[PDB]
Amino acid sequence: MRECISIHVGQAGVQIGNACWELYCLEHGIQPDGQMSFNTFFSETGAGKHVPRAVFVDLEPTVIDEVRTGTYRQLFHPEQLITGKEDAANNYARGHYTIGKEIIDLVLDRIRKLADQCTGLQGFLVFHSFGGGTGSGFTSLLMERLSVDYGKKSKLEFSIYPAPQVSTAVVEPYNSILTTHTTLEHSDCAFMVDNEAIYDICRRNLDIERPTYTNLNRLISQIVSSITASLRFDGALNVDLTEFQTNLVPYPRIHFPLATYAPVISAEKAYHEQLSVAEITNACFEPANQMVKCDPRHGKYMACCLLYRGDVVPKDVNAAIATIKTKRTIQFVDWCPTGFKVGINYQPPTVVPGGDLAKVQRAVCMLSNTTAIAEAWARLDHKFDLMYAKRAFVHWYVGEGMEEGEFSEAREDMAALEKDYEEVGV
Amino acid sequence: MRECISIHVGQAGVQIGNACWELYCLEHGIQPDGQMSFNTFFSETGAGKHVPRAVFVDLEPTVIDEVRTGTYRQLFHPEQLITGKEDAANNYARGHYTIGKEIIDLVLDRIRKLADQCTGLQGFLVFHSFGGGTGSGFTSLLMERLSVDYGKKSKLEFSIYPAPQVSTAVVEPYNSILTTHTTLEHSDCAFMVDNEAIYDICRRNLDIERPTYTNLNRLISQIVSSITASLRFDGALNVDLTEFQTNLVPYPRIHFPLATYAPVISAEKAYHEQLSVAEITNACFEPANQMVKCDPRHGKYMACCLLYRGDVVPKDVNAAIATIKTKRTIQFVDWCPTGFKVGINYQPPTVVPGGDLAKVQRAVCMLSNTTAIAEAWARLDHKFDLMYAKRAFVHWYVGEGMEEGEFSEAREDMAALEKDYEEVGV
Amino acid sequence: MREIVHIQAGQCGNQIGAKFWEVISDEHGIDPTGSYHGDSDLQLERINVYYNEAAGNKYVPRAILVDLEPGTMDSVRSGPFGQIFRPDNFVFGQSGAGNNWAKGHYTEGAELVDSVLDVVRKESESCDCLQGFQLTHSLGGGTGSGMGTLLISKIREEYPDRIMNTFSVVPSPKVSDTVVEPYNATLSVHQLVENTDETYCIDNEALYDICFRTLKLTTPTYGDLNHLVSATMSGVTTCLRFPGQLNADLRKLAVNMVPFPRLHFFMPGFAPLTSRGSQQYRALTVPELTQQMFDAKNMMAACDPRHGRYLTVAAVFRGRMSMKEVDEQMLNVQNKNSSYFVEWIPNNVKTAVCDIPPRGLKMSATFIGNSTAIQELFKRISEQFTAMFRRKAFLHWYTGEGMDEMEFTEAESNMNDLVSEYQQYQ
Amino acid sequence: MREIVHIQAGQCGNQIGAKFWEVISDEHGIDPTGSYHGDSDLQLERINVYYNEAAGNKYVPRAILVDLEPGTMDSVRSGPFGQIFRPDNFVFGQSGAGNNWAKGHYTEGAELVDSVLDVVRKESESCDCLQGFQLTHSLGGGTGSGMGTLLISKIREEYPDRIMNTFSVVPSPKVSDTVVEPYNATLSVHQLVENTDETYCIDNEALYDICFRTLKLTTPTYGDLNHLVSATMSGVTTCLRFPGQLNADLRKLAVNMVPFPRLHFFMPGFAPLTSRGSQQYRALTVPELTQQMFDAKNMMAACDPRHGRYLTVAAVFRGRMSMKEVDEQMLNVQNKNSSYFVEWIPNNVKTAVCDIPPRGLKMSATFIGNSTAIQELFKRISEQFTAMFRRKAFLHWYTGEGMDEMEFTEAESNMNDLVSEYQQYQ
Amino acid sequence: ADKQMSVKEDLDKVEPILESALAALDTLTAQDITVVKSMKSPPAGVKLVMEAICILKGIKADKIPDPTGSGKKIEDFWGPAKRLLGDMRFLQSLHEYDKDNIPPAYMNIIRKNYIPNPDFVPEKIRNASTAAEGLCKWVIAMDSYDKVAKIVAPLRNELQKLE
Ligand SMILES: Nc1nc2c(ncn2[C@@H]2O[C@H](COP(=O)(O)OP(=O)(O)OP(=O)(O)O)[C@@H](O)[C@H]2O)c(=O)[nH]1
Ligand SMILES: Nc1nc2c(ncn2[C@@H]2O[C@H](COP(=O)(O)OP(=O)(O)OP(=O)(O)O)[C@@H](O)[C@H]2O)c(=O)[nH]1
Ligand SMILES: Nc1nc2c(ncn2[C@@H]2O[C@H](COP(=O)(O)OP(=O)(O)O)[C@@H](O)[C@H]2O)c(=O)[nH]1
Numbered sequence A, B: 001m002r003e004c005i006s007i008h009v010g011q012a013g014v015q016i017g018n019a020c021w022e023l024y025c026l027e028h029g030i031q032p033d034g035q036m037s038f039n040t041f042f043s044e045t046g047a048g049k050h051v052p053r054a055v056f057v058d059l060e061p062t063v064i065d066e067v068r069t070g071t072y073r074q075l076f077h078p079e080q081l082i083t084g085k086e087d088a089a090n091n092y093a094r095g096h097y098t099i100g101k102e103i104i105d106l107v108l109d110r111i112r113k114l115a116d117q118c119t120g121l122q123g124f125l126v127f128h129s130f131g132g133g134t135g136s137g138f139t140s141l142l143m144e145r146l147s148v149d150y151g152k153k154s155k156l157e158f159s160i161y162p163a164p165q166v167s168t169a170v171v172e173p174y175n176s177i178l179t180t181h182t183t184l185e186h187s188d189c190a191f192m193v194d195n196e197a198i199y200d201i202c203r204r205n206l207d208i209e210r211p212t213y214t215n216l217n218r219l220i221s222q223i224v225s226s227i228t229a230s231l232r233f234d235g236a237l238n239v240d241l242t243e244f245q246t247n248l249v250p251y252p253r254i255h256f257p258l259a260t261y262a263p264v265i266s267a268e269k270a271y272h273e274q275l276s277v278a279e280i281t282n283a284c285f286e287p288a289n290q291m292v293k294c295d296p297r298h299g300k301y302m303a304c305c306l307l308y309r310g311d312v313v314p315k316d317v318n319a320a321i322a323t324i325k326t327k328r329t330i331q332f333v334d335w336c337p338t339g340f341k342v343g344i345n346y347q348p349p350t351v352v353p354g355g356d357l358a359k360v361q362r363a364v365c366m367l368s369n370t371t372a373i374a375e376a377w378a379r380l381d382h383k384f385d386l387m388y389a390k391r392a393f394v395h396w397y398v399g400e401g402m403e404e405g406e407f408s409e410a411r412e413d414m415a416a417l418e419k420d421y422e423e424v425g426v
Numbered sequence C, D: 001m002r003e004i005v006h007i008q009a010g011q012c013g014n015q016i017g018a019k020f021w022e023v024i025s026d027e028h029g030i031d032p033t034g035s036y037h038g039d040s041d042l043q044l045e046r047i048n049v050y051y052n053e054a055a056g057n058k059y060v061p062r063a064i065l066v067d068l069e070p071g072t073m074d075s076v077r078s079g080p081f082g083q084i085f086r087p088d089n090f091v092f093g094q095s096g097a098g099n100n101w102a103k104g105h106y107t108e109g110a111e112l113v114d115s116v117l118d119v120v121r122k123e124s125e126s127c128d129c130l131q132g133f134q135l136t137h138s139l140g141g142g143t144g145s146g147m148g149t150l151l152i153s154k155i156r157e158e159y160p161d162r163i164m165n166t167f168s169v170v171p172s173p174k175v176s177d178t179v180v181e182p183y184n185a186t187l188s189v190h191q192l193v194e195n196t197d198e199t200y201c202i203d204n205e206a207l208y209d210i211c212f213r214t215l216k217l218t219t220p221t222y223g224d225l226n227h228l229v230s231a232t233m234s235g236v237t238t239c240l241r242f243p244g245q246l247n248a249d250l251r252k253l254a255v256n257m258v259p260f261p262r263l264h265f266f267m268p269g270f271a272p273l274t275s276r277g278s279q280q281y282r283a284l285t286v287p288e289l290t291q292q293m294f295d296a297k298n299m300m301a302a303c304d305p306r307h308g309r310y311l312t313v314a315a316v317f318r319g320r321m322s323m324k325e326v327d328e329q330m331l332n333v334q335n336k337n338s339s340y341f342v343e344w345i346p347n348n349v350k351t352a353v354c355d356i357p358p359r360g361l362k363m364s365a366t367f368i369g370n371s372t373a374i375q376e377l378f379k380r381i382s383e384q385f386t387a388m389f390r391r392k393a394f395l396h397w398y399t400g401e402g403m404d405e406m407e408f409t410e411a412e413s414n415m416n417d418l419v420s421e422y423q424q425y426q
Numbered sequence E: 001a002d003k004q005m006s007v008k009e010d011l012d013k014v015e016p017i018l019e020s021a022l023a024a025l026d027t028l029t030a031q032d033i034t035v036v037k038s039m040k041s042p043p044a045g046v047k048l049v050m051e052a053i054c055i056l057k058g059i060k061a062d063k064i065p066d067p068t069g070s071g072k073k074i075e076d077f078w079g080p081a082k083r084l085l086g087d088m089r090f091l092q093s094l095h096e097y098d099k100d101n102i103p104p105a106y107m108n109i110i111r112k113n114y115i116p117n118p119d120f121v122p123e124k125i126r127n128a129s130t131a132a133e134g135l136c137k138w139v140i141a142m143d144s145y146d147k148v149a150k151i152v153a154p155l156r157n158e159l160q161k162l163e
């Protein structure tokens, strides 16, 4: 069968993983014990206790230690969980050059072992953060290794991108740019979600006044579930990982689709609602409901894909799309007339006990590339330029096996990217 | 029936024996009392009791005294347990020339009596240490006597080889070399395991942080059990002691196969595993899982043998082997294309109460010759050259009925051996 | 992993350290006997960092106590928590530094250093993986300045790759306590600038302010002032010692807090700073805590923040809160105090959320600010020093110990260099 | 088997021996009456080595007590453990050697030797198999040097094939106790070099160091110093007397410890050396013990180890431990002391693990080092001696007893020969 | 006197290289060097450069404990460098160092490989680390200055004999 690999890297990655593996279990019907075709994300072990086809890495052992004591514990392999000595401490030069070129080889081992299991290895999913220390260098390093090994195989990147406003870490801007330098030339596709937009979505649509990391994470995780379920499940028009790559990336360099899961609806909002197919389409195209801090109207939807789930009938979908094409406001790029692929899966999303969402019969993750993400790029280039004028925190990185020139080249790359998007828009 | 003789020599030998005879009993179903076709390693008594077909020798009575008080005590017939006055004290010249040429004749007696029992005497197994005092000279002496007596019969040598790093005894290097001078021209086959590699295996694969001699020994013992079980048990493709000799010795001089038992898996590592036939093959060929401190990639596997046990089906095995041949990394010698023999035995390994291992349905002891063991030879030659430059501890040996010239000739022999391996590699 | 080696030098260092240890003990459930009696598993999850456990669940700090006199460290022993310290820790001479830098560094303390360094070495090799060295040492005394500084230098030579953080208690110009306080501080700083990664500068003046105004204690015991600093340090290191939603390593903090090699000096705070029964007019919220922290009354440094702009900020919160709330809260803050956040660096603040409260406050926080304003502290001491150097005052005590005028001139140069750099990045 | 014949000569020899016997008694469960009241079967498994049993469970040390005076050996009798000896074993005259080598060897002791040798001959014939002769005899006295040396010579003539080991208490240059200490030592050594297989050189200086610093006894009783040496000898001989994971015979130790015929002198140590309640701060581990042993403070010899390099080392541990741990631990150690381990010999250390603790310490260890540094001890005495010989000092006492200047010159030659050989193998 | 002026013209031709050494001393920045050194393992180029500084100082490479794989102890010059850099007055010490007081051994080590190496050449070091520019320049300029002391100093002494 078509079968996959999970790689959670950095604290962010692992936390998302904690949420992810909860969801899959609840869907496939697996208990935390591992006891009960899920082939894609569970490799049914000899003894049984179907165990995830996943990898869990962090230099900060603190994080994965929490994993090892959670109820989600006996689910993961002993092998699954890998530890490092000391954390990357928001240095890209520690993630890549120092502590990376130590524990990476052990990780490559576990990967290779897992690779051997897969009859039909589809590809990879790499949960990291452009702007953690771990996920900024280490991720890039890992990617590089895997490209050398496999090359042809599918690679996906759920990247927690810096929120232009929201603040976590001072050097955050440097990390993203170094990641981009290296990532864009490996990962064939990169779905990037920033926390601020998710927070917006948490407050408004779910009426939640205290958005915890957990809740934000469950939302992030349901975006993937939809991307997968085409692999994981039956149904008309089933999509593959390769299909996204192919469909959504007319130009090989530009592969940064935004995501957006609707409906994002609480226990109340279930009633005062009927959740029709076409309702949910409109919701997805909403400027506010985007999972990035980007307004889609400030460019053109280059390519779109929509992954309807549960009780969705294609005729319903086709009409909604007609409507969408009709609206002149919502612009699309010149080169392609029909910029949709529709995948309808008989499996509905099943929602996590003690969570945000209620039973939505129909749902849709729209993964839509637009030239409008060039706004979030520019912002971050600017943040970096400002601090690299001063050459601040230059000392940390340099002394850790880095090049000052690497910083300059990274910007150059960003300029090129931005230029490309401009061309496409024209 | 095909029937065998055990000879534990030196403290190391006897300790291994303590472990060995535990295992066999647990397998054949014998209690420590001797109460209950095991013909090969148990000779049935008058009524009920079974007696091990073994010889237990040490000049240090301390060791075998422990035997005489253990729960494994009444299992033996104290015809077997022979004592000497004073220990060889890590002198080869006391093992061979002095205390050897005293108690050896008594031992030859017990051997002969035991030989008479055997209808079909297959051969011998000689647990000694290249680098104890007892097992360095005495072993050689014993071997010599047995060669004069039998000649045609099968002789095997589980030799605790010096770990290049790990330290037990200062004169250790001298002892090995003198043993080699004499041993290689008697024992038709010599499976050599060093403690350091076993320790590595203990720490990593079983997650044990306190590797005691006992645990290391159980591992050593399970390697033999597999070598035997082809004699001891039924099944497809059954191997004989003579078969190894024939298989593993293309050139009559070079016969030093490494061993490696997989799976080496704890109580945890049971789950989050599939124990498949082909999984375990890969594990065996692993550079780390070797029972010597040798990297197999630093030469070529010349001839290999694999002794699968329990629920192994040949078709599974044949495919794994195809895969292995495919990998170009794992180098083979040009001139022998198919360098495997496969023995599949319906008996699975049964694991010792209070021990390392859990219930592994499938297991395989790979006894593989490589030219890569020439690295461990060189190292030891060097250690010896360094100390024999100074002529250190020369006085001990000389005054005990030895030749200084014997030391020189021994090196010459080693040079020849090394040269031979080089030729083979070419 | 990532264990810290504490140090206490001089009466001041020794006493804050005394109270510091007591504080953390209570946080980790350890009683005066070195036995654990805590109900929180998380305490012993990472006890490592701060305590080495022995036979019978004795728990012992990784702390070295240094005093050129016996007396203050003998009071330590008499104290309730003093018994948890080891004699190995209590390393003393019997000649008092008597508020002479030259006695501490050159003469009396040079005699006692090697012995201390041996204990340092004992404590380094006993580490699973050494992270850093916390030195609580006054700037203005004898045993803190000279002896402390000497200790820092040698330790940095021994372990240069590791964290050196020093909660150094500095002179308050308005409440001078000692004669040559200027001399001690200036000579200390000269060395400190070059020998530490991060230094938390705490003056007694500010502590008094806190006690008097907010805690409403109009009888401050050194105990109370100490209790303050103790909680500050606990907060700094909470992340390493407890799981978190975002976890800040000591290196993480340093890396996030430092624009340049040199400007590593900080001002810690704490919240909620309230009197007993002045909490019922209040309600513990993220906004509340932030407001308290960013107020001048809750700064444990000399400088008024508003006489300058924070270069960077790192607010390490504790207890169970919404990352969103903190994010959103400290975004407002960035905006409001536009004047008192440096432009160079966007996302001036860096928020880290430990998931553990401090055993009795449902929420809590700990500030770390790097303000250009702290230049004023250095100015005050530079001025005080300069005037007295104009009269070559008290010279004889120092020239007597080998020290030279040129050294003092160079120390003045150091001070001047520190203030100019802050001015540049105003 | 392998029984040892103890000897005690001179007040010093007699007193250490006194305490030595008491020590072993407790280790083997024997009370003051010569009755066994021990709960460990292993004690009486090999009681042989050190005791003769007679009618009614008699327990008699195979120890001969020699004193040219009656007094010290009459104190022995009065003592608590004194009455365990068979009174026929105290052989004395009534003329004091009075710290004259010539009185001990030539004159007063030549009269009393034949009687002693008869008692020696009794003991040898009462042995199942005699292994060796332990002589506790001071170097610097009268009854230890002359009488002791004479005893050694004749015994070696009688039993040349056997072990002669002497825990000889040597002069400390810094704490001289006697007049002609130089004369006594030099004449003794000249003979000893040629008459013994191994000599454990223990000076009072080092003992004091241990007591004062580590055991924190600032009132050393000769009792305490003696208790120290006693435990040292027990440790040496533990292997013969108890079962072990690796067992070191006296000959084994000698053979492992000696590069050349002559350089048989050693420095013993012991660990854990801690004060009461001091132990507390330690926690008993293999690393702990090794670190203690290899520290200069826990050497019972004059020489600082670091003023030279250990030619060989033999660490005979006690109690229940991981051979792996010891192996791995003492490999690190080899690496750490790169400069204080001689190149000639790889695997400088030799580890022997007795399976018996010393009745009250869960773990323990006993060092034996052969250091080039001990040349310094010989130098000091050579110098002291040489100067006094320049003035032909105290000559009359010796010429009076038949001794000659040429003898003294030859003794000087012996000393010179000893120091040059060490220099060569530095 | 004209001969003296000629040796003093030799010096004037050499004065820029002496000035280059002086400029190298100057290019020792305040605390960028201090921090690149504080960090454990900077670009190998700078690790070569500080090793070169170690050789310049005359401090010897130590022996790393031999790995299991290799009996021989690894040759490490970075640990000496670690302690040398660690000195508070290390930058001051560089400023204090004298061209005349240079081991010819150091020139042998550095000129041959380090002076004509492309990575060691300033341009690559300019890339490698801004802080290291100074250090590389220092090593190169110091070697040139000891090339220069070796050639001009005996000549100046010979000139002094002529004078
Ligand atoms: N969604 C989400 N994002 C997180 C979480 N924790 C951190 N992040 C994001 O990750 C970045 C902060 O760095 P981390 O990811 O924690 O760092 P790391 O990758 O663990 O690297 P080190 O801390 O140096 O080991 C920012 O983009 C944060 O918003 C979390 O639990 N959920
Ligand atoms: N696996 C294993 N190896 C051991 C054991 N004891 C000793 N050895 C090895 O044996 C060698 C040390 O000498 P021993 O074998 O004890 O000596 P011996 O053969 O008894 O000779 P003598 O002590 O002189 O009687 C080294 O290679 C040790 O690692 C043990 O219990 N298990
Ligand atoms: N915060 C605090 N400061 C103290 C304490 N004891 C003394 N100090 C300060 O330490 C400074 C003098 O230095 P000190 O370390 O006592 O000199 P030493 O005894 O020679 O080391 C004074 O400015 C005191 O205010 C204390 O318990 N807490």
Ligand SMILES: Nc1nc2c(ncn2[C@@H]2O[C@H](COP(=O)(O)OP(=O)(O)O)[C@@H](O)[C@H]2O)c(=O)[nH]1
Pocket: D009, D010, D011, D012, D013, D015, D016, D097, D098, D099, D138, D140, D141, D142, D143, D144, D169, D171, D177, D178, D204, D222, D223, D225, D226
């Ligand atoms: N360790 C130890 N040394 C002792 C003891 N009694 C005496 N000595 C030492 O023995 C040395 C003198 O020799 P001694 O044997 O008394 O002379 P003798 O009485 O004529 O044999 C002195 O250096 C003392 O330090 C003792 O009980 N223990």
Ligand SMILES: [Mg+2]
Pocket: A010, A011, A058, A060, A063, A087, A134, C247
């Ligand atoms: Mg992290």
Ligand SMILES: [Mg+2]
Pocket: B010, B011, B058, B060, B063, B087, B134, D247
């Ligand atoms: Mg033995």
